[PDB]
């Protein structure tokens, strides 16, 4: 209806991306997606950004690519879900790392009800992120579930009262942003680089990623801060 189809805001080291078509339940638009991709590039390219939050306006969530298919942000992405996260909203959710929902949020992948296909990658990701039979139930029946059920399935990690999803997400982003950005981002890189590698092969990649972190200046600041019984002040190097 009014304004840009996605808003981008900054809060400390956290970049907040708000899908903003509330009159259309934040249904994806091409302008919404262009704003999202450039925010994604901002997250990757700005060393001052340590965390990203994805949310929707107007009591809905959503009902280089869109749902981050073929691309994943190099910094942590927290979903703050209020209200419906159906179809596109649940596919996007699987491209986020940490997941908070309001109590009244709903999840579901309804594409097959209309003989459509989930193009956002749910048929690849969902069985890898929650127990197989629970994933199959969602993908094949297309039924909608509550936030409580989603947490029970392991699809999200936190359920908060309605309206507090963004608040809790910002608490989590504040904890991430206070951690060493080089460590946080190396962990993500390892998770992605080692996917579907048997662990003896994966450990070789993971060990080299880790040793690189230990060679940083920030890896000296962390221990110094702990010995000086004070909070660390990381510089992304």
**How many residues of this chain bind a copy of itself (CB under 8 A)?**
81
Residue 133 binds to a copy of itself (criterion: CB under 8 A):
yes
| Region 186-215 residues binding a copy of itself, contact defined as CB under 8 A | 186-188, 190-191, 194-200, 202-203, 206-207, 209-211, 213-214
| SS3 state of residue 85 | strand
Rounded distance between C-alpha atoms, residue 183 and residue 147, angstroms? 31
Active site residue 195: no
Q: How many helices (H) and strands (E) does the chain have?
A: 9, 9
Residue 121 binds to a copy of itself (criterion: CB under 8 A):
yes
Single out the catalytic residue among 1, 9, 31, 91: 91
Complex with a copy of itself: residue 1 or 199, whichever CB lies closer: 199
Complex with a copy of itself: residue 83 or 95, whichever CB lies closer: 95
For residues 16 to 55, the per-residue mask of contacts with a copy of itself, x marking binding by CB under 8 A and - elsewhere, is ----------------------------------------
Rg (CA), the chain: 18
Among 102, 119, 118, 101, smallest CA distance to 110 is for: 118
Single out the catalytic residue among 103, 111, 199, 201: 111
Active site residue 111: yes
| Residue of 76, 88, 89, 108 interacting with a copy of itself (CB under 8 A) | 76
6-18 burial: b if 16+ Cβ within 10 Å, else e: bebeeeebbbbbb
Contact 38, 69 (CB under 8 A): no
Only segment of 9-17, 38-46, 54-62, 148-156 that touches a copy of itself (CB under 8 A)? 148-156
**What would the two tokens of residue 72 be?**
């994943």
Residues with a known catalytic role: 91, 111
């Amino acid at each position: 209806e009014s304004g840009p189809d996605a808003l981008v805001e900054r809060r400390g080291h956290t970049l907040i991306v708000t899908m903003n078509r509330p009159a259309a339940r934040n249904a994806l638009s091409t302008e919404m997606m262009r704003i999202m991709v450039q925010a994604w590039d901002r997250v990757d390219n700005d060393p001052d950004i340590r965390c990203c939050i994805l949310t929707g306006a107007g009591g809905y969530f959503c009902a280089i690519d869109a749902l981050l298919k073929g691309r994943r942000l190099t910094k942590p992405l927290i979903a703050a879900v209020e209200g419906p996260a159906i179809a596109g909203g649940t596919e996007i959710l699987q491209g986020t790392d940490i997941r908070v929902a309001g109590e009244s949020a709903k999840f579901g992948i309804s594409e097959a009800k209309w003989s459509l296909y989930p193009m956002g990658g749910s048929a690849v990701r969902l069985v890898r992120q929650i127990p197989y039979t629970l994933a199959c139930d969602l993908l094949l029946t297309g039924r909608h579930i509550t936030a409580a059920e989603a947490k029970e399935m392991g699809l999200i990690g936190h359920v908060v009262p309605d309206g507090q999803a963004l608040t809790k997400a910002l608490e989590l982003a504040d904890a991430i942003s206070a951690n060493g950005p080089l460590a946080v981002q190396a962990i993500l890189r390892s998770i992605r680089e080692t996917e579907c590698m048997p662990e003896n092969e994966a450990f070789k990649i993971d060990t080299q990623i880790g040793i690189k972190v230990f060679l940083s200046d920030d890896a000296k600041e962390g221990p110094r801060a702990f010995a000086e019984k004070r909070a660390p002040n990381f510089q992304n190097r």
